[PDB]
Design a protein around this ligand. Structure first.
Ligand SMILES: COc1ccc(C2(CNC(=O)c3ccc(NC(=O)c4ccco4)cc3Cl)CCOCC2)cc1
Ligand SMILES: [Zn+2]
Lengths: 46, 162
């Protein structure tokens, strides 16, 4: 895909769940730099 | 082209990245179906990704965007989760591989909630979970996310029904 004309990205902003933060979409790979690689496990709650 | 520099846990940079990862976990409406059930992570390793070509390509585009948007790149630090993380760190993001239509169309997706990106590490909707146990909520297998520098420029505001 391509950005909407006159835009460089899309912001997907949840409007129903008021605690959910945004997502974002870009359409050129040069518009991001993968700065940190994070290796992790999810933790089982107590 | 790419080297990975391991950060020590006593490094302020390790600590600030860990805090962004931990503090942006939320509950998900699938009850943990896709990404598993958790409130926090065990961070095992944080590596700085160093690639001079990819960085110069990034800063070149960032300046073009900034000049198109009243000198404002609108740069953010955002999470990316997918099964393509190991290809991304060597080759850079490539929109030619990002042809899968999600909610905001084809493109390269990032999230403010680390737990949102965690839903995609094993594929769409968590895929079949980890390779070893086929468990979307695996507490054993190691996962990887990218914490990325992203130029948004002028961003189309799409309100979503989520
Ligand atoms: C198969 O698992 C998937 C996980 C998430 C997605 C969505 C987000 N995808 C992207 O953000 C995305 C980003 C980057 C790349 N690839 C590269 O940049 C790349 C470079 C070199 C090799 O690959 C591929 C994809 Cl699919 C999540 C929601 O649905 C829409 C697609 C699609 C499939
Ligand atoms: Zn596993």
């Amino acid at each position: 895909a391509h950005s909407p004309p006159g835009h460089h990205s899309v912001t997907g902003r949840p409007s129903v769940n008021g605690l959910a933060l945004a997502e974002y979409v870009i359409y050129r790979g040069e518009q991001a730099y993968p700065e940190y690689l994070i290796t992790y496990q999810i933790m089982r709650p107590e | 082209g790419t080297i990975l520099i391991d950060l020590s846990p006593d490094d302020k940079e390790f600590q600030s990245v860990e805090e962004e990862m931990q503090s942006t976990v939320r509950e998900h409406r699938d009850g943990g179906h896709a990404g598993g059930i958790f409130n926090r992570y065990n961070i095992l390793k944080i590596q700085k990704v160093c690639n001079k070509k990819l960085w110069e390509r990034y800063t070149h585009r960032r300046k073009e965007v900034s000049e198109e948007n009243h000198n404002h790149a609108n740069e953010r630090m955002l999470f990316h989760g997918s099964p393509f993380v190991n290809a991304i760190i060597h080759k850079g993001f490539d929109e030619r591989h990002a042809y899968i239509g999600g909610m905001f169309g084809a493109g390269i997706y990032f999230a403010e909630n680390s737990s949102k990106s965690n839903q995609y590490v094993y594929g769409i909707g968590g895929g079949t979970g980890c390779p070893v146990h086929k468990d979307r909520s695996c507490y054993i297998c190691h996962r990887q996310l990218l914490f990325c520098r992203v130029t948004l420029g002028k961003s189309f505001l799409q309100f979503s029904a989520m």
